Amino acid sequence: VFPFREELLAAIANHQVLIIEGETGSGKTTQIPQYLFEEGYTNKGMKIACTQPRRVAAMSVAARVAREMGVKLGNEVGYSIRFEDCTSERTVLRYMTDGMLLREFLSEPDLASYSVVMVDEAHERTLHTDILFGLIKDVARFRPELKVLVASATMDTARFSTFFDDAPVFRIPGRRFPVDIFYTKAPEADYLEACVVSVLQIHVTQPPGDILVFLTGQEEIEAACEMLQDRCRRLGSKIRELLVLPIYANLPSDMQARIFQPTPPGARKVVVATNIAETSLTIEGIIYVLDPGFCKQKSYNPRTGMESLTVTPCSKASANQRAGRAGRVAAGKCFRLYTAWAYQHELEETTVPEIQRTSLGNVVLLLKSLGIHDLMHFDFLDPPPYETLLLALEQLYALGALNHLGELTTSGRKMAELPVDPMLSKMILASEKYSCSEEILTVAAMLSVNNSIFYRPKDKVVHADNARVNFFLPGGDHLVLLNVYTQWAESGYSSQWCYENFVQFRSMRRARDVREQLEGLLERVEVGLSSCQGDYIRVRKAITAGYFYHTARLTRSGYRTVKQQQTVFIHPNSSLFEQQPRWLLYHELVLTTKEFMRQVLEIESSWLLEVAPHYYKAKELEDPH
Amino acid sequence: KSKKSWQARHTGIKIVQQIAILMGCAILPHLRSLVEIIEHGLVDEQQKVRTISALAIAALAEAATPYGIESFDSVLKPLWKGIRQHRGKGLAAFLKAIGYLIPLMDAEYANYYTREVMLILIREFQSPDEE
Amino acid sequence: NPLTKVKLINELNEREVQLGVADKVSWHSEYKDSAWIFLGGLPYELTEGDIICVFSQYGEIVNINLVRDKKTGKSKGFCFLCYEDQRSTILAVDNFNGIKIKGRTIRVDHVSNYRAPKDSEE
């Protein structure tokens, strides 16, 4: 990027909006925001924001840039993530997730605080970034003072330039060294074992260079870290030391920093990463990539009207990006866990933008908070289907977040204050009326974290479920979350306690932080913290106030959902111990082979009618199954 | 509900069983005040006490015919746990209790208890014992 | 319940000798092609040699199977005995039922399918 710095400055000086493209590792995120030199934001009493779709990229990059700037992190350079802020009055340059900047927009439509906004990693085309692009287009009319830069890995400029009213483009020429590609002879059904074998072979045979393995999620990554680490030690005497490090969205900052650590000599470093490593950041020294070809992707089904995260095969474009990581330092190698045919024929060329993939309820509330009346007309780069938007408005209406007019209510305005899905925000806001606010606060925090809460090894299941049973509340998975959180609050030797208990400390700790941040929100907002003694009814009611849309009734056999009348089974994770639970509220819809309903709690039907009479009116309901 | 020996609880549940099989439907107005005893069993450490408690629930379900389905609601969950985790003569007594309770029940819940018990019946067709 | 099946299998043979049932349909044409018999109620002081000595009267057991526990136990009470001929199993279930050896009485039944580690009723 440095060879281009003058060229970049000229474009920045000349235009309000510009697009910048370059391969990952070219220095877009770290160097460009150094626009502080030309900008002199601080003298003006402004900051510059750089937005990242990934929390890890925002946190790690900010830490790096603070070092590059020779300032303390949280000072001149800081980051802002949902329940994690590391900023101060001193902060010049703020790296943040796109979601966060959108939240700041909600408070201040002009984003007057920033002289320059840089939307990075635009190619990911996340929802937050898509909204941000729409909003910024308009804000630019309002403030001649504001400059915007859109950065993207994809050499493809045209669509963005046109959207931006033929904004100018600066492209950085690709430096990537050649990477040879290895393919498997036949398709491999179970990729993780294969990935492990390839890593070990590379470490023994290959000349120095670090390895980057792409996995799907935390549990899988953690499993691979242990297996690879154990096998590496076994290599032990004959082979050099091999360090292994996980990287995924949840990782704490101290852990994220570990990936950068140097390898021992002849020793190698292996970083086992999710797709964060694709375009988001670079670990210097990687020569070899192992690509299983899978990723956790959000999928939306319009007929069913539900989101679900599934592991699916990667796009060809992402396969190319992964291979590219091998090329940064010197000629590298990429091991593809699939055949050449699959790469050519099977892989879809590109993934769809998240907007097409998502339930819109959160986005609608956000847009309304933005003060956007005409939702259909909003200038999205890729407009969502009108029907998904209509459904979202209706849901918000039943939620009472919006009135029939489509205007925000007091509740909608407050819910906008909380960083959570509308159902969760509404449930939390109402809870004091239930006299359960303290318990609801814990449940909401527990819901905001992965179900890494309970750990069940495949071999280890018996002991693990015995451990879970201690917390388990019959006919109330939501209550179990409360029990485990409360116990987690008091347990000597916390780290060891979690392990013996088969609980994930990482998830529980995150839940602890979120609860603290949420409590602060409640204090600021004046939502009293309430509690009672032994009132399960009030908790079930409070859950209902938020979740009444996600309810299932016990069928003659099986379960049927109130909305969309879908046949579903209670997920095997919970036993409908009680015969009495005819009606259950469920947190999630999982679509493996069949349709399952996860995290269920029994509820009285009369409560649903009492709690949401508009939703519960028979007129809307179809002919009685 | 005395805890010094299991023989006294076995005797009292046996009293409940022969009352339920002796007199037909006059035990029904005193059904609930008799069945609120029986859920203190089925979780005891003796197999004989759990077996005769399932036999007493089966006898009360045979005596009721078909009344009192909302009074046996505190009994179905340990019976479901026992047909899931326990096998042997306790499984047979639990299956007798559930098969006598399910004609008393409404169509959806009895259908759900019927469709997810026939696998146990097909599994226990290989049983050698005559009882 | 643990030893009333002795009385049940005895009443079966008493009903067979009362009704005058010929040997073609007297319960042993249904359990053909199987020399395996199940034992019940054995004391814990019995080794395999004593079981061979007490049930080799009508023919030597070709295949013995005691239920020896994995680590902490010695026996449970069950046994499988596979003789040579099926008429030996007929005579063993008709003659060795109802006897007692050191206290607790024992019972003889048929298996007819395959050996199992634990499926029966203690």
From Swiss-Prot, chain A:
Q: Which residues form the Helicase C-terminal domain?
A: 198-371
- Please tell me where ATP binds in this chain: G22, E23, T24, G25, S26, G27, K28, T29
Q: Subcellular localization, per the record?
A: Nucleus; Nucleus, Nucleoplasm; Cytoplasm
Residue ranges of the Helicase ATP-binding domain?
Answer: 9-173
Taxonomic superkingdom = Eukaryota
Task: List the Gene Ontology MF annotations in alphabetical order.
Answer: ATP binding; ATP hydrolysis activity; helicase activity; molecular adaptor activity; pattern recognition receptor activity; RNA binding; RNA helicase activity; ubiquitin binding
Q: What is its EC number?
A: 3.6.4.13
**What GO biological process terms does the UniProt entry carry, in alphabetical order?**
antiviral innate immune response; mRNA splicing, via spliceosome; RNA splicing
Q: Its catalytic activity? A: ATP + H2O = ADP + phosphate + H(+)
Keywords, in A-Z order: ATP-binding, Cytoplasm, Disease variant, Helicase, Hydrolase, Immunity, Innate immunity, mRNA processing, mRNA splicing, Neuropathy, Nucleotide-binding, Nucleus, Phosphoprotein, Spliceosome
Tell me which residues bear Phosphothreonine. Answer: T312
Report where it is expressed, by tissue: Expressed in the spleen, thyroid and testis. Also expressed in the brain and cerebellum.
Q: Which intervals of this chain are the motif DEAH box?
A: 120-123
One GO cellular component, as annotated: cytoplasm
The outcome of changing H123A is: No loss of pre-mRNA splicing activity
Q: What is the effect of changing G324N?
A: Dominant-negative mutant. Impairs pre-mRNA splicing activity. Fails to interact with any of viral RNA forms
Q: Give the top-level enzyme category.
A: hydrolase
The subunit field of the Swiss-Prot or TrEMBL record says: Component of pre-catalytic spliceosome complexes. Component of the minor spliceosome, which splices U12-type introns. Interacts with GPKOW. Interacts with TRIM6. Interacts with RIGI.
Q: Which family does it belong to?
A: Belongs to the DEAD box helicase family. DEAH subfamily. DDX16/PRP8 sub-subfamily.
In the UniProt entry, the disease listed is: Neuromuscular oculoauditory syndrome: An autosomal dominant neuromuscular disorder characterized by variable features including myopathy, neuropathy, hypotonia, joint contractures, growth delay, chorioretinal lacunae, sensorineuronal deafness, agenesis of the corpus callosum, and seizures.
Please state what the protein is called: Pre-mRNA-splicing factor ATP-dependent RNA helicase DHX16
UniProtKB/Swiss-Prot annotation, chain B:
The entry's comment on post-translational modification says: Phosphorylated. Phosphorylation occurs concomitantly with the splicing catalytic steps.
Effect listed in the UniProt record for changing K48E: Does not affect the stability of the SF3B complex interaction with U2AF65. Does not decrease the affinity to RNA
Q: Where is this site: Interaction with SF3B3?
A: C25
**Subcellular localization:** Nucleus; Nucleus speckle
Q: List the disulfide bonds.
A: none
**HEAT repeats, residue ranges:** 1-25, 28-66
Function as written in the Swiss-Prot or TrEMBL entry: Component of the 17S U2 SnRNP complex of the spliceosome, a large ribonucleoprotein complex that removes introns from transcribed pre-mRNAs. The 17S U2 SnRNP complex (1) directly participates in early spliceosome assembly and (2) mediates recognition of the intron branch site during pre-mRNA splicing by promoting the selection of the pre-mRNA branch-site adenosine, the nucleophile for the first step of splicing.
Query: Subunit structure, briefly?
Result: Component of the 17S U2 SnRNP complex, a ribonucleoprotein complex that contains small nuclear RNA (snRNA) U2 and a number of specific proteins. Part of the SF3B subcomplex of the 17S U2 SnRNP complex. SF3B associates with the splicing subcomplex SF3A and a 12S RNA unit to form the U2 small nuclear ribonucleoproteins complex (U2 snRNP). Within the SF3B complex, interacts directly (via HEAT domain) with SF3B3, SF3B5, SF3B6 and (via HEAT domain) with PHF5A. The SF3B subcomplex interacts with U2AF2. Identified in the spliceosome C complex.
The family note in this entry says: Belongs to the SF3B1 family.
Tell me what this protein is called: Splicing factor 3B subunit 1
* Species in which this protein is naturally found: Homo sapiens (Human)
The gene designation is: SF3B1
- Range within the parent protein: 653 to 783 of 1304
Curated annotation (Swiss-Prot), chain C:
**Where is the protein situated, by its record's location annotation?**
Nucleus
Q: Which domain of life is it from?
A: Eukaryota
Specify the RRM domain's residue ranges. Answer: 35-113
User: Cystine bridges: which residues?
Assistant: none
Q: Where is this cross-link: Glycyl lysine isopeptide (Lys-Gly) (interchain with G-Cter in SUMO2)?
A: K7
Quaternary state and partners of this protein?
Answer: Part of the activated spliceosome B/catalytic step 1 spliceosome, one of the forms of the spliceosome which has a well-formed active site but still cannot catalyze the branching reaction and is composed of at least 52 proteins, the U2, U5 and U6 snRNAs and the pre-mRNA. Component of the minor spliceosome, which splices U12-type introns.
Known role = Involved in pre-mRNA splicing as component of the activated spliceosome. As a component of the minor spliceosome, involved in the splicing of U12-type introns in pre-mRNAs.
Family note: Belongs to the IST3 family.
Q: What is this protein identified as?
A: RNA-binding motif protein, X-linked 2
Q: What is the lineage of its organism?
A: Eukaryota, Metazoa, Chordata, Craniata, Vertebrata
